[PDB]
Each structure stands twice: as C-alpha cells, then as structure tokens.
Design a protein that fits this description.
Shape: globular
Number of domains: 1
Structural class: mainly beta
Main location: cytoplasm
Keywords: Cytoplasmic vesicle, Disulfide bond, Signal, Taste-modifying protein
Pfam families: Thaumatin
Number of helices: 4
Largest sheet: 8 strands, mixed
CATH superfamily: Thaumatin
CATH topology: Thaumatin
Radius of gyration: 16 Å
Distance between the termini: 25 Å
Helix content: 10-25%
CATH class: Mainly Beta
Family: Belongs to the thaumatin family.
Strand content: 35-45%
Order of helices and strands: EEEEEEEEEEHHHHEEE
CATH architecture: Sandwich
Oligomer: monomer
InterPro entries: Osmotin/thaumatin-like_sf, Thaumatin, Thaumatin_CS
Length: 206
Amino acid sequence: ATFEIVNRCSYTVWAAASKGDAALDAGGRQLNSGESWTINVEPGTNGGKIWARTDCYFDDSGSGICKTGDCGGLLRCKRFGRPPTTLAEFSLNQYGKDYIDISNIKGFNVPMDFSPTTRGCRGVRCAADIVGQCPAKLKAPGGGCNDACTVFQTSEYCCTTGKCGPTEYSRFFKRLCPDAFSYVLDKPTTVTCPGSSNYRVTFCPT
C-alpha cells in the first residue's frame, strides 16, 4: 500500500512511520513546508502509525532530539514516539478490509487529515486548534497538548483495568475533534476501507 505524507504546515516537520517494533519504509524523513514523501507499507501490516515530530535537531548520523514525537532520538523511527503525538493509525488487509483512524489518546501536536486516495471509504480529520485551547494542566512545554494518561498516570485516564469512562480531559479532545479517539474506550471512530487501499496523510490540512 502506498501512503503519501504531505506537510501543508508553514513549519518543517519530521514525519515518522513505525509499527512499534520496526520502521515502516525508511521510518522517518524531514518534510519542509509543502513537501510530500511517498512510502510503501507491506500488505498485512497491523498496528502501523504515522505522526509528525516538531522542533528536531539531527546530526549527520541521524541521531538527535525532537520536542514532540521523539522516537528514541532517531531520524528513522523504529519505535513509537513520545507524546504528545496526533496519530494516524492503520491496520491493513485484515480479513479483506483496511481499518484507519485518527487518535488523540497520546495527545495532540499537529493537525492531520487521513484520507484514502482510492475508492470506497471516507477520510477522517482532526484540524482544530487543540494546542491553543489546551487545558493548562495538559500543555506540554516543548509544544503540544498531552493526554491525561501521560500527565497523571492514573488507572482511570490510562484505562488500566479495562474499565474507565470519559473524563473532563477526554471530553476536551472529543469536543474539538469528534472523529478522533479521545480515550481508550471511546466509541470507535475507525473507518473500514477496502483491503489494499492507498492513502494520504496531510499535516495542517486547513
């Protein structure tokens, strides 16, 4: 499957793509404003994620640091990134179907649209100004708006026992971005697409 990752933001981002235990494609790349990066993701990939990282410094070896979404200091991510990270999440060719969503369960850094470029399903978006409206207790100094689990580490926010409800914090994300997951047990906003669809992830779509 082909993913085109497009940076429409006015600032540079460092895109990242991983399935948690390996890179997808090259795993990461710098995208200046307007740049597009096309990756190939193997059919059958389960639990893939794409995100943006902000304010990164890398040396010639591809080692460094980012203020949001850092994935153990690497340009080419092998693992998932440090919150806050708006997430494009996907599982491909699962019994004939692809499953896509956007999640704010690990917080929000950059607005995102995640849409098919082929036929048969709709896209999803979270493009509200979550950082500007972020509750004081969730604001991340390096930038972004953390989720409550990251900040407070409670069973309720992290849904550790498999039973939890919505919270004042989860409701904040959900009010601004209804089509994204706001907590672990949120009513799913997953979209079902045809198996072997192709996609575009746009940072700063509006």
